[PDB]
C-alpha cells in the first residue's frame, strides 16, 4: 500500500511543484514570424474582447457582400484603428437608380399619387434628404451629431457593474455535452466524445 | 379625420392600419433581388419562387434607419395599394392623424428627417411618434386578454410599468414611470432576431451542409420549430432525444416552403424522395443565449444582468414596485415557454421581500402593442398629446424633436 | 474514467490561482487532459503516482484506483456507465447499524445481542 | 449512505426538549439551575409583542383592507409600503414568539 | 411534538464583521457575520452570532456550497456544493446537490412517536461530547 | 454575589499586566463599584464577559460563572 518511507532529494524535491513524466516524432512549430515576433516582444483580455465582437458582428449580418464593410463599421463603432484590427484579427450597393426605377414598374400596379411641387428651401432640403445614398457610417463621423450624444447612445446604454451573474456553463465543443468535459491536447478545446473528438481533430484543430 | 391612421414601424415587419381596424396590416420592410437580378418588393417576397440565393436590402440598419428614399417608396406602396390591401384606402392624407412608433434610441438627425418627412411629403395634419415603450401603460383603459405570470408563485393609464421588448433588431429594457420612460436607466441587448438567424445558420452548416446562402428557410425553422428550455439547459439536454425534431427541406419542383415532422405523430406517413434534417440539439441550445451567452462562445453579460443593472440605477423607492408590474412585447417572445422561464429566473436573484409578476400577451406581440397604441390614439389624452402642422410650421423642424418627441427632453 | 496515465503537473497557490493541475491520461483511443480543482490535486499528491501506469478515477466518491502499470493495455473511452451491485445479508446490515463501526464486528464476531428495534 | 436518507422530516432533537439530563450534572449545580429557572426572561416578549400590535391594528384598521392587497400594491408607492411595513412587523413578532 | 425552524439554501456571501472597540474585556472578535442565502423562491440576508460563525467555518464551506442551518440548537450541517457549479472542472471529488425549494427559512414540526424504551437506552447512553 | 455587570474597564496600555481594573454590578435595587485585583483579572479573561450580562461570582473561591 502507502509507502512510509520516500526517497527525497533537498534540492530536486520541493513540496510546492510536483512534476512527473514519461512517422518521425517531430514537435509542432509555428514558421509565422508575425506570429513569432509577437511572442518575443509581448474578466478577459482586449484581444479575447475583439475576436468576440468581431465573430458577433460578422454573425449579425444577413449577407455574404455585406462581410468585408462589417469590420469597418466595428472599428468604427469601437474606435480601434481599422487596419490594424482588421490585419491582427482574422475573420471568421443597396440603392442602384435602374433597381429604383424597377420598383417603380414594380408597384405602379396601383398608386394613387397627389403630384405637386413649389420651389421653396424647405422642399430643397426635402429633395435632399429623400435623394441622400448616406451609409450610417457616413452619419456616425459626421460633425452633426454631438459627441455627448454618441456617448449617450453608445457607451451608456451598455450596462457597466453586472459583468456576470449566472454560473459558468461550458460544454462539448462539437454537441454540447456537458456530463464529460476534456480539453484537447493541442488547441484547449473540450471534447466529450469519440465521434466529437473524431471530427473536431481533423476540421476544428487548427492549431494541431 | 376623427379616427387616426395607426402605423408600427419595424426594422422585420410593418404594422399599419386605421384605429377603427381592430388588426394591422402585416407587411415586411425589406428589399430582395435574386442572382438574376429581378428584385421583388417586401409584401412579394413571399409570392417568389426561388429561395436559394437571396440578397437582402432593408433601410432599417442596425441602430436606425439611413436610407429614407427606400422607406418612402414602402410606405407608398402599402399605404396607396387599395387593391392590395381589402378595404383600406387612402386618397390624401391631409386631415388624417398619425401615430407612429420609432426605435427609443433614434438619432436626432434620422428623427428630424422622419418629422420633416413625414409633416410635409404626407402632408398630415396632427402626429404623435414614440416609442412603443410609452404606448404600454395605456392598457388599463380598455379590458382585454391578458395572461400573468408570478415568478414567486410555483387617469386610466398606470404610472409604474416595467417595459421589456425582444424585437428583430435588438432587446431593450425600459423602465417607465408617470408614462414618460427613464431614458437614464434604459438598458439594451443586442440579441435580436439576426444574432438567432445567424447562430442556426452557422450550427446547421457545422451539423450539415452550408445553408448560410439560404436566409429565408433558416428564418422560418426558427419560426416553426425553436424553443427555449422549460427548466434548465441540463434537462433540456437529458431528455433532448425525446425532444427530437424532423425537419423536410422543400423541393422547387415540388414545395416552395418545408414542413415540421414530428416522429411520434403518424398523421404525416406519405414518403418523399427529399431528405429530411433531424433537429435534437439546436431546438432549445439557440435560445439558450438570453440566459447564458457563454453557450455561443459571446462575452455579452446577458438579461438577467441587464435587468439587475437597470433597477439598480433606477430610485431605490420603486425598484420593487417595477418588477410588480412586468410585460413583454416582440416577435422574439413568441417562443414557449420563455416567460414562466423568464420570470423564474428573474425571481431566484431577487430577495424574498420583493415578488416577481410577469404579464403576457396571447399570440403574437406585434398585434398586441398595435392595439396598444390603437387604444392610446382611442384615449383622450392622445387628443393632449398630438401635435398641430401650424405648430410645428410656426417652430423650427429641430424643436419639435429636441422638445416634445426627442429623449433630450426628458434625459 | 482509467487508462494510462503520460502526463501529470502540479503548482503552488499564486496569487493569480490558488492551485492549477493538469494531467493527462491516454488510452487506446484516447488522450486528453483534465483540470484539477484543488481537491483531487491532493488526492493525487496524497499518493506517490508515476506516469505510464493504469489507474482508474472514481469521480463521485473522488478515489483513486491504481489498475496495475504498462502489463494492461487501455480499451476505449475514458468515462463509461456502468452499476455496481452488492449482495448483503440482513445481519450484516443490522450489524452496521448497530454500532459506530459495525462491519468491523462482520469478522470479529462481537456483536452483542443487537437490539430488537434495530431489526 | 443509503440509509442516511432524509430523517429530519420524522425526528427529534430529543435533547432540546431536556429528555438528556443524565449529562447535566457535570457542569450544572442545583442553586445556579434553581435561580435560571426562576430568573427566566417571560413575560418581556409578551410586552414586546404587545408594544408592536398596538401599532399593528393601528396600520390594520387604518388601511389594512386594501394594503395587503395584491391588485392596490401594484402601483402605489404608499399602499405598497404600507403592506411591506405590515408583513415586516408581522414577521418580527413571529420572531420574537419563537 | 416539536416545532423548529431552518434557514437553507446556497451561500452567496459571509462576512465577519470585526468591532473597532476593545472594550477592556477582549481582544479580538467578530462583532458578528453576515450571511446571504438564495433559494428558487427568492434570496434572504442573515446576521450571525460568533459561535455560528465559528460553526460553520469549522464546518469548511465556502461561497458556492448549499448548507443547513438550524435556529432551535444552532446546528450547521454543509449539504453539498449547488449543481450550478458542476461544469466548473472537468473532474471533482465533491458530489453536487440541486438548490433547495423554499424562499430561505421555513417552519415545520415533527410528530415523531419514540416509546419510553428508546428514552432510557438514550439517557443511559449518551451520544454527546467530542471527548477522546 | 449574583447580578448584571454595567461596564469593564481594564487599563491594559495605561500600566498593563493587571493594572487593577474596576467594573460595576447592578441590581433592581442597588448597585456598587467593585476593586479587582491580578486574579480577578486572569480569571475574568476566561469565560469573557462583555457587559450587560447577569452573572454570579463566588465569594469563597472567586468562581465565575455566567447566568
Ligand atoms: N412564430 C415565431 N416563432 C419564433 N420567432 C418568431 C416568430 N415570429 C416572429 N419571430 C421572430 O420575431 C422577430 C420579429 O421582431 P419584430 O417585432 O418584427 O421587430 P421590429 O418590430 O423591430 O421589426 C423576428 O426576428 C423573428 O425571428
Ligand atoms: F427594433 Be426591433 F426589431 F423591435
Ligand atoms: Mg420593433
Ligand atoms: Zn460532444
Ligand atoms: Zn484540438
Known sequence: ?208 | ?411 | ?119 | ?98 | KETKEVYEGEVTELTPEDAENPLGGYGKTISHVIVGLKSAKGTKTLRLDPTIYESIQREKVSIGDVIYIEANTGAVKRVGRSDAYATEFDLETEEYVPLPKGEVHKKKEIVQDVTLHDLDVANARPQGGQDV
Not at chain 2, 203 to 227: A, G
Open chain 1, 1 to 208: 500500500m502507502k509507502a512510509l518511507v520516500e526517497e527525497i532529494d533537498k534540492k530536486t524535491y520541493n513540496p510546492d511543484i510536483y512534476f512527473t513524466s514519461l512517422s518521425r516524432p517531430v514537435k509542432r512549430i509555428n514558421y509565422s514570424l508575425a506570429d513569432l515576433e509577437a511572442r518575443l516582444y509581448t474578466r478577459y483580455t482586449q484581444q479575447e474582447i475583439l475576436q468576440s465582437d468581431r465573430r458577433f458582428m460578422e454573425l449579425n449580418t444577413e449577407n455574404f457582400s455585406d462581410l468585408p464593410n462589417v469590420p469597418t463599421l466595428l472599428s468604427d463603432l469601437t474606435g480601434v484603428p481599422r487596419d490594424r484590427i482588421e490585419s491582427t484579427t482574422k475573420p471568421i450597393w443597396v440603392l442602384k437608380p435602374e433597381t429604383l426605377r424597377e420598383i417603380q414598374l414594380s408597384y405602379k400596379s396601383t398608386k394613387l399619387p397627389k403630384p405637386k411641387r413649389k420651389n421653396t428651401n424647405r422642399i430643397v432640403a426635402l429633395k435632399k434628404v429623400l435623394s441622400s445614398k448616406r451609409n450610417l457610417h457616413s452619419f456616425l463621423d459626421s460633425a452633426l451629431l454631438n459627441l455627448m450624444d454618441k456617448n449617450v447612445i453608445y457607451h451608456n446604454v451598455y450596462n457597466k457593474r453586472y459583468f456576470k451573474v449566472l454560473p459558468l456553463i461550458t460544454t462539448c465543443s462539437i454537441c454540447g455535452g456537458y456530463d464529460s468535459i476534456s480539453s484537447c491536447v493541442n488547441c484547449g478545446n473540450k471534447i466529450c466524445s469519440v465521434s466529437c473528438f473524431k471530427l473536431h481533430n481533423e476540421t476544428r484543430c487548427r492549431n494541431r
Open chain 2, 1 to 411: 379625420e376623427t379616427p387616426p391612421i395607426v402605423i408600427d414601424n419595424g426594422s422585420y415587419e410593418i404594422k399599419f392600419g386605421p384605429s377603427t381596424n381592430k388588426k394591422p396590416f402585416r407587411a415586411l420592410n425589406a428589399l430582395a433581388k435574386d442572382k438574376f437580378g429581378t428584385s421583388y418588393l417586401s409584401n412579394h417576397i413571399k409570392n417568389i419562387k426561388d429561395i436559394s440565393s437571396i440578397t437582402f436590402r432593408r433601410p432599417h440598419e442596425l441602430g436606425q434607419l439611413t436610407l429614407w428614399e427606400l422607406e418612402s417608396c414602402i410606405w407608398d406602396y402599402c399605404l396607396f395599394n387599395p387593391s392590395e390591401f381589402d378595404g383600406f384606402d387612402l386618397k390624401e392624407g391631409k386631415g388624417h392623424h398619425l401615430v407612429a412608433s420609432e426605435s427609443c434610441m433614434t438619432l436626432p438627425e434620422l428623427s428630424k428627417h422622419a418629422d420633416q418627412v413625414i409633416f410635409e411629403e404626407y402632408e398630415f395634419d396632427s402626429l404623435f411618434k414614440s416609442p412603443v415603450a410609452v404606448f404600454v401603460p395605456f392598457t388599463k383603459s380598455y379590458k382585454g386578454e391578458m395572461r400573468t405570470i408570478s415568478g414567486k408563485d410555483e387617469s386610466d393609464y398606470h404610472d409604474f410599468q416595467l417595459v421589456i421588448d425582444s424585437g428583430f433588431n435588438c432587446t431593450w429594457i425600459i423602465p417607465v414611470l408617470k408614462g414618460i420612460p427613464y431614458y437614464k436607466a434604459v438598458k439594451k441587448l443586442d440579441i435580436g432576431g439576426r444574432f438567432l438567424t445567424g447562430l442556426l445558420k452557422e450550427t446547421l452548416s457545422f451539423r450539415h451542409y452550408n445553408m448560410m446562402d439560404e436566409t429565408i428557410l433558416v428564418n422560418n425553422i426558427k419560426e416553426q420549430c425553436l424553443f427555449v428550455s422549460p427548466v434548465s439547459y441540463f434537462d433540456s439536454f437529458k431528455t433532448k432525444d425525446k425532444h427530437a425534431l424532423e425537419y423536410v427541406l422543400p423541393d422547387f419542383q415540388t414545395s416552395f416552403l418545408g414542413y415540421v415532422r414530428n416522429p411520434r405523430k403518424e398523421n404525416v406517413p406519405l414518403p418523399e424522395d427529399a431528405q429530411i434534417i433531424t433537429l435534437t440539439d439546436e431546438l432549445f441550445t439557440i435560445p439558450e443565449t438570453f440566459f447564458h451567452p457563454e453557450i455561443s462562445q459571446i462575452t455579452k453579460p446577458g438579461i438577467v444582468e441587464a435587468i439587475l443593472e437597470s433597477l439598480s440605477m433606477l430610485p431605490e423607492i420603486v425598484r420593487p414596485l417595477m418588477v410588480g408590474n412586468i410585460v413583454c412585447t416582440g416577435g422574439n417572445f413568441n417562443l414557449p415557454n420563455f416567460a414562466q422561464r423568464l420570470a423564474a429566473e428573474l425571481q431566484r436573484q431577487l430577495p424574498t421581500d420583493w415578488t416577481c409578476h410577469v404579464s403576457v400577451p396571447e399570440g403574437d406581440c406585434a398585434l398586441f402593442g398595435w392595439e396598444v397604441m390603437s387604444q392610446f390614439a382611442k384615449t383622450d389624452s392622445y387628443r393632449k398629446a398630438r401635435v398641430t402642422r401650424e405648430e410645428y410650421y410656426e417652430h423650427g423642424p429641430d424643436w419639435c424633436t429636441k422638445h416634445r418627441f426627442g429623449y433630450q427632453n426628458w434625459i
Open chain 4, 1 to 98: 449512505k443509503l440509509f442516511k436518507k432524509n430523517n429530519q422530516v420524522n425526528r427529534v432533537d430529543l435533547d432540546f426538549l431536556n429528555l438528556v439530563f443524565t449529562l447535566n450534572d457535570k457542569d450544572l449545580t442545583s442553586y445556579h439551575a434553581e435561580e435560571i429557572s426562576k430568573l427566566t426572561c417571560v413575560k418581556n416578549f409578551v410586552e414586546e409583542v404587545n408594544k408592536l400590535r398596538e401599532t399593528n391594528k393601528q396600520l390594520q384598521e387604518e388601511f389594512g383592507e386594501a394594503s395587503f392587497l395584491n391588485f392596490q400594491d401594484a402601483n402605489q408607492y404608499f399602499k405598497y409600503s404600507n403592506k411591506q411595513k405590515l408583513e415586516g412587523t408581522v414577521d418580527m413578532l413571529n420572531f420574537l414568539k419563537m
Open chain 3, 1 to 119: 474514467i482509467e487508462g494510462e496515465v503520460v502526463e501529470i503537473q502540479i503548482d503552488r497557490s499564486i496569487t493569480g490561482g490558488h492551485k492549477q493541475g493538469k494531467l493527462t491520461i491516454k488510452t487506446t483511443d484516447m488522450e486528453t487532459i483534465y483540470e484539477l480543482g484543488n481537491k483531487m490535486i491532493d488526492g493525487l499528491t496524497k499518493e506517490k503516482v508515476l506516469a505510464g501506469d493504469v489507474i482508474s478515477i472514481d469521480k463521485a466518491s473522488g478515489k483513486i484506483t491504481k489498475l496495475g502499470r504498462s502489463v494492461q493495455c487501455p480499451e476505449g473511452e475514458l468515462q463509461k456507465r456502468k452499476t455496481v451491485v452488492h449482495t448483503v445479508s440482513l445481519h450484516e446490515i443490522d450489524v452496521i447499524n448497530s454500532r459506530t463501526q459495525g462491519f468491523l464486528a462482520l469478522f470479529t464476531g462481537d456483536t452483542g445481542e443487537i437490539r430488537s428495534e434495530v431489526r
